[PDB]
Amino acid sequence: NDHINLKVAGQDGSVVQFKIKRHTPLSKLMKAYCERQGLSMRQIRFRFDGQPINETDTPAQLEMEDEDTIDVFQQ
Amino acid sequence: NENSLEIEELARFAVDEHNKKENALLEFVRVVKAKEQVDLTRFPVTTMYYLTLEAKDGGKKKLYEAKVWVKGYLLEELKHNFKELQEFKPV
């Protein structure tokens, strides 16, 4: 039950969903999204509810819910 | 999302596999919708693709839902990844 499904929505209109553990640091998700897409990480920014996401932040700490969306765009 | 060429490739795959397994002759037309779900909680990391595609069944255009499973999550590996059609049905 410690699993959560998050939508990662890019500026290009793409959406990729991720199943992750709620106490896993979100850096794993962010790194997976960049690797999958072929993106360089230095460029892009992840936002949740308009705010930035620390690499160490976890879904539990941010009170994320199943099917919430993470926005991603480049600087 | 649904008009990317990797999605089109998996859609054709789903249609081709469905045609072999069922001895059918559906003809691929287009993808109308595609959800991509990467599962990071388990090994091996896998992706599930839920495809809504349009295919000709004897001149009639119909809508189908397919589930395609992939043993991989990097797009750069997708062409050579192991894949399975796990579900194909009219929506």
- The experimental resolution of this structure, in angstroms, equals 2.3
Asked if the C-beta of B41 comes within 8 angstroms of chain A's C-beta atoms, the answer is yes
Q: Is the peptide bond before B44 cis (omega within 30 degrees of 0)?
A: yes
One-letter identity of residue A61: Q
Token code pair at residue A30: 């962010």
Residue A51 to chain B, least CA–CA distance (Å):
24
Q: What are the structural domain ranges in chain A?
A: 1-75
Which of B32, B48, B38, B30 minimizes the C-alpha distance to B84? B48
Q: What is the DSSP track for A14-43?
A: -EEEEEEETTS-THHHHHHHHHHHT--TTT
Whole-number Å distance between alpha carbons of A47 and A49 = 6
- Using CA atoms, how far apart are residues B30 and B52, in angstroms rounded to an integer? 9
Nearest to B85 by CA among B2, B1, B15: B15
Q: Which residue in A has a C-alpha nearest to residue B1's C-alpha? A: A14
Given the structure tokens 């919708």, which residue do they identify? B33
CB-based contacts of A26, cutoff 8 Å, min separation 6:
A20, A46, A53, A54, A55, A56, A57, A58, A59, A62
The Cβ of residue A2 has, within 10 Å, a number of other Cβ atoms equal to: 11
Task: Give the domains, in start order, of chain B with CATH numbers.
Answer: 1-91 (3.10.450.10)
Closest-CA residue of chain B to A17: B37
Q: Is A18 an 8 Å CB contact of chain B?
A: yes
The CB density around residue B67, as the number of other CB atoms within 10 Å, is 15
